[PDB]
Design an enzyme around this catalytic site. Structure first.
Site, mmCIF file in Angstrom:
data_model
loop_
_atom_site.group_PDB
_atom_site.id
_atom_site.type_symbol
_atom_site.label_atom_id
_atom_site.label_comp_id
_atom_site.label_asym_id
_atom_site.label_seq_id
_atom_site.Cartn_x
_atom_site.Cartn_y
_atom_site.Cartn_z
ATOM 1 N N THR A 77 4.429 0.504 6.802
ATOM 2 C CA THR A 77 5.256 -0.588 6.305
ATOM 3 C C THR A 77 5.203 -0.627 4.778
ATOM 4 O OG1 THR A 77 4.807 -1.878 8.315
ATOM 5 C CG2 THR A 77 5.735 -3.062 6.427
ATOM 6 N N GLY A 78 3.991 -0.549 4.236
ATOM 7 C CA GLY A 78 3.783 -0.506 2.801
ATOM 8 C C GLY A 78 4.543 0.613 2.112
ATOM 9 N N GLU A 87 7.724 -7.781 -22.999
ATOM 10 C CA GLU A 87 7.548 -7.242 -24.345
ATOM 11 C C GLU A 87 6.558 -6.080 -24.353
ATOM 12 O OE1 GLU A 87 7.962 -10.427 -27.963
ATOM 13 O OE2 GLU A 87 6.424 -8.870 -28.142
ATOM 14 N N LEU A 116 5.122 -10.287 -20.605
ATOM 15 C CA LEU A 116 4.959 -8.980 -19.978
ATOM 16 C C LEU A 116 6.109 -8.026 -20.309
ATOM 17 C CD1 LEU A 116 3.478 -7.037 -18.153
ATOM 18 C CD2 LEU A 116 4.477 -8.199 -16.170
ATOM 19 N N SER A 127 0.840 -1.193 0.000
ATOM 20 C CA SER A 127 0.000 0.000 0.000
ATOM 21 C C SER A 127 0.878 1.247 0.000
ATOM 22 C CB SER A 127 -0.940 0.014 1.207
ATOM 23 O OG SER A 127 -0.226 0.218 2.417
#
Ligand code: GTP
Ligand code: GDP
Ligand code: NZO
Ligand code: CA
Ligand code: MG
Ligand code: MG
Lengths: 427, 440
Positions: free
Chosen positions: B145-146, B254, B252, B140
């Site tokens: 912490t996020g 590419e 992904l 988050s």
């Protein structure tokens, strides 16, 4: 008169495999590598592309190169996958991410020596190597970046050997990434310096042919590659079968290339056929000749009427009246003698092979050295500039050690190439 | 090879991790005990699902994942939950005291006490990779912490793993499901700090997800449980190209080549369709054309913004299920001549297309209808900068009075870190404005 074949990258290995499966059928070679045909004409020049294995098997003189194993594993599991010499599979793991810099400077540089070892091993077996051929695209990273690196190193070790390429040009119509004009532009300058022939196979033209002409509403890469392998079979018929012509690669290039840098050819083929779709009426010689000169059979997406032919070569295949061929060929020229330069006398040459390709009773392959090819390079240049103006997507390259200057140089020498073509168009 | 290691940081990161890995297991036929019957190569393999799962000799398929939180109660539910057998105990790392929605505690005070242990556990996952591709970091923006610990981790990962790729799934703060007030601070701080260390970041606006759950799934008052199941589907669509094979599959990386024109411009806008309830999906097929067109309806975006009032620099379509190129191409042609789609002048206009044949799965007792085909659009739009603008403004309002700043200073931070972070954000907003101006 051996030829060493190299295929690099995804596109290079896919059209390369297709090429080997087509000519193997023409020479009567099965996927095991055993000859079962019915004509000695199939074997008279089979050593050009094939090595003889103890236990009479024929092994393609082919080297398969990639920076990732994905496509080459597809090859090994393909129809003729087992025909290739297993030691000639040279591959890394990291891939190139459609990045010329990765192919040419970092990832490719780490693998390029291993490829040269196999090249050398195949060359030292050749009684008299006449040259190399390479299949690859210019829009990705491996075929474009590592392929041209390869070409540079081969010219260092074999400076007196012919190097020819079948090079797939990128197009927004058939596009993987947005950086294709970057990779193509960087590659084109390498080709200008270090090849004797470059067959400009435009994915735009291949698309339009499959769509507008072959009436395939959603063409795949497979459909596109059917046209490529059919053209490559024709371009090399001269070398693989006995006939009017027995020129080696060098003699072929001498009569086609009047100026060292202008060696980018517009290939063509007739009749245009989609895969599987049989059709039963063979073309008359006037039909063959008219189609192979028509822009709709061109695979470079350039209008030949917008330039002038420096040299033209045409190979006709099948049982037919060459006298009738002579008349139709000299019909086309004498009708349109304003699209041929007049300071190269008799610059339109023809040859016949008795053996037709599979599926056709007669066919014709076109090889045009036209100044109209400049339209291809102008197209790439415009797309290059549109991004480079804003230095867009450059971080993919600078992150591998490249400088903006190398792009500016690449841009400039392609614009020189373009203007060099313009010089002879107005002569 | 080409392994990807997932790192889940803080409550949002961890609980979204639960949703994703549960969904992955269902997609690959992996049981809660880690056993996978259809997998005949026991103890190892180089299959597509091996990018995300490692294998033990006992046939257990183990997520290449680390869960980290500075407080234990969220991860404890993973340790005692349905999929507790899936994870080795050393993959689940907890401290005792969280960051209390304070970036400083996450990045400095509390974070430094556990960062070495975390790097060690990550190192143990990397050492089991034959060709590590990079990392996926879930967090988050608003948590201590996020925000704080993630940016600390991203900084350390750059040192220990050079230029190895790092992708983010970042939760953008929405007041509807938040009880925090200082999140604009934490958001601006982590974005500034992480910007140089992230190659590509997928922002998920909680308000966008909240609205979609309310309007499309008829959920009266969505919970984290409701949001995460939807988020997991979008995450699945994005990672599907890494976990499955297929001729028409496009990796992904590419798409990434197209999505990131400059290092700092690496925030794709995700749009997902179809999001529909079982009640409404009954006797109603959603065609390729219908779901593709839904990708240009702003209500279906992962981030609240208006692309119709911005410019495109890239447009990617990631399909999964019963989808063939012919239908895609036709749908696109229609849209291009009926939608407000305008590209900057320095970028080509073609849509890059990917198709995975394996159809979408739903979690049992979920709200989403099981459909035959879904699509996730990833576009690079100048309009995403609107999300920065809203956040930066909330930041400015509080920082002008230095509200709540004493909490940050008390944990060792200086006001100079705030202004420096905010200036980076101002430059970022200007960057997005500059890439949209026509060329000379
Ligand atoms: N979508 C979604 N958002 C969440 C979830 N859990 C928390 N959030 C959001 O995350 C923000 C608060 O950050 P947290 O992740 O809870 O805090 P943290 O990372 O554990 O850091 P601490 O302050 O130390 O607790 C708020 O904006 C929440 O709405 C979740 O499960 N799903
Ligand atoms: N004609 C043709 N073109 C291809 C094929 N595969 C890729 N391309 C083109 O090649 C370019 C991508 O290069 P690619 O060979 O995939 O990259 P590489 O593997 O790193 O060398 C794009 O312009 C594609 O359109 C193919 O099978 N046939
Ligand atoms: C693999 O490299 C080549 O095949 N190069 C090549 N260059 C060529 C030039 C001409 C011809 C050819 O078939 C001719 C027909 C009529 C006169 S020359 C065939 C060619 N093949
Ligand atoms: Ca296995
Ligand atoms: Mg490719
Ligand atoms: Mg917490």
């Amino acid at each position: 008169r051996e030829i060493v074949h190299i295929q690099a990258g995804q596109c290079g290995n896919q059209i390369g495999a297709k090429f080997w499966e087509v000519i193997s059928d023409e020479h009567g070679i099965d996927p095991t590598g055993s000859y079962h045909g019915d004509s000695d004409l199939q074997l008279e020049r089979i050593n050009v592309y094939y090595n003889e294995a103890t236990g009479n098997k024929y092994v393609p003189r082919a080297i398969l190169v990639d920076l990732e194993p994905g496509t080459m594993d597809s090859v090994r599991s393909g129809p003729f996958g087992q025909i290739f010499r297993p030691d000639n599979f040279v591959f890394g793991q990291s891939g190139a991410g459609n990045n010329w810099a990765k192919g040419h400077y970092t990832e490719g540089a780490e693998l390029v020596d291993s490829v040269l070892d196999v090249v050398r091993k195949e060359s030292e077996s050749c009684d008299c190597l006449q040259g190399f051929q390479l299949t690859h695209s210019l829009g990705g990273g491996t075929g474009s970046g590592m392929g041209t690196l390869l070409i540079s190193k081969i010219r260092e070790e074999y400076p007196d050997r012919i190097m020819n390429t079948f090079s797939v040009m990128p197009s927004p119509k058939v596009s993987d990434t947005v950086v294709e004009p970057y990779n193509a532009t960087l590659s084109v300058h390498q080709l200008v310096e270090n090849t004797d022939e470059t067959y400009c196979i435009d994915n735009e033209a291949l698309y339009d042919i499959c769509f507008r002409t072959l009436k395939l509403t959603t063409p795949t890469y497979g459909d596109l590659n059917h046209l490529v392998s059919a053209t490559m079979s024709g371009v090399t018929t001269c070398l693989r079968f006995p006939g009017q012509l027995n020129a080696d690669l060098r003699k072929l290039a001498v009569n086609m290339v009047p100026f060292p840098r202008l060696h980018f050819f517009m290939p063509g083929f007739a009749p245009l056929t989609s895969r599987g779709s049989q059709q039963y009426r063979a073309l008359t010689v006037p039909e063959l000749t008219q189609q192979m000169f028509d822009s709709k059979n061109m695979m470079a997406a350039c209008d030949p009427r917008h330039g002038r032919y420096l040299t033209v070569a045409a190979i006709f295949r099948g049982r037919m009246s060459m006298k009738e061929v002579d008349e139709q060929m000299l019909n086309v020229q004498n009708k349109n003698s304003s699209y041929f330069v007049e300071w190269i006398p008799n610059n339109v040459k023809t040859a016949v092979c008795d053996i037709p390709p599979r599926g056709l009773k007669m066919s014709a392959t076109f090889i045009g050295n036209s100044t109209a090819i400049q339209e291809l390079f102008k197209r790439i240049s415009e797309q290059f500039t549109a991004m480079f103006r804003r230095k867009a997507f450059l971080h993919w390259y600078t992150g591998e050690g490249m400088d903006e200057m190398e792009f500016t140089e690449a841009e400039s020498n392609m614009n020189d190439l373009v203007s060099e073509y313009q010089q002879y168009q107005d002569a | 090879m080409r392994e990807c290691i997932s790192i889940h940081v803080g409550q949002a990161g961890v609980q979204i991790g639960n949703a994703c890995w549960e969904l992955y297991c269902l997609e690959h036929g992996i049981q809660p005990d880690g056993q996978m019957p259809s997998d005949k190569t026991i103890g190892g393999g180089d299959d597509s699902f091996n990018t995300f799962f490692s294998e033990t000799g006992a046939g257990k398929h183990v997520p290449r994942a680390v869960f980290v939180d500075l407080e234990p109660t969220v991860i404890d539910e993973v340790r005692t939950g349905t999929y507790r057998q899936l994870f080795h105990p050393e993959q689940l790392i907890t401290g005792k005291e969280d960051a209390a929605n304070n970036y400083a505690r996450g990045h400095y005070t509390i974070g430094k006490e556990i960062i070495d242990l975390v790097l060690d556990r990550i190192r143990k996952l990397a050492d089991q990779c034959t060709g590590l591709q990079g990392f996926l970091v879930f967090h988050s923006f608003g948590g201590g912490t996020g925000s704080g610990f993630t940016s600390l981790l991203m900084e350390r990962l750059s040192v220990d793993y050079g230029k190895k790729s790092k992708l983010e799934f970042s939760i953008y703060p929405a007041p509807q499901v938040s009880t925090a007030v200082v999140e604009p601070y934490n958001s601006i701080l982590t974005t500034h700090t992480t910007l140089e260390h992230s190659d590509c970041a997928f922002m998920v606006d909680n308000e966008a997800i909240y609205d979609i759950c309310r309007r499309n799934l008829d959920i009266e008052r969505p919970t984290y449980t409701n949001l995460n199941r939807l988020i997991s589907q979008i995450v699945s669509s994005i990672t599907a190209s890494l976990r499955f094979d297929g001729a028409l599959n496009v990796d992904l990386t590419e798409f990434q080549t197209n999505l990131v024109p400059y290092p700092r411009i690496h925030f794709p806008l995700a749009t997902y369709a179809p999001v529909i309830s079982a009640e409404k999906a009954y006797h109603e097929q959603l065609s390729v054309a219908e779901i593709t067109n839904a990708c240009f309806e702003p209500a279906n975006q992962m981030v609240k913004c208006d692309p119709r009032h911005g410019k495109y620099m890239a447009c990617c379509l990631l399909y999964r299920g019963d989808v063939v190129p012919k239908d895609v191409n036709a749908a696109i042609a229609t849209i291009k001549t009926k939608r407000s789609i305008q590209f900057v002048d320095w970028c080509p206009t073609g849509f890059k297309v990917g198709i995975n044949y394996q159809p979408p799965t739903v979690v049992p007792g979920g709200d989403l209808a099981k459909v035959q085909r879904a699509v996730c659009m990833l576009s690079n739009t100048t309009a995403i900068a609107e999300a920065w603008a809203r956040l930066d403004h909330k930041f400015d309002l509080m920082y002008a009075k230095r509200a709540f700043v004493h909490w940050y200073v008390g944990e060792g931070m200086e006001e100079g870190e705030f202004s420096e972070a905010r200036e980076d954000m101002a430059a970022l907003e200007k960057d997005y404005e500059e890439v949209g101006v026509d060329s000379v």
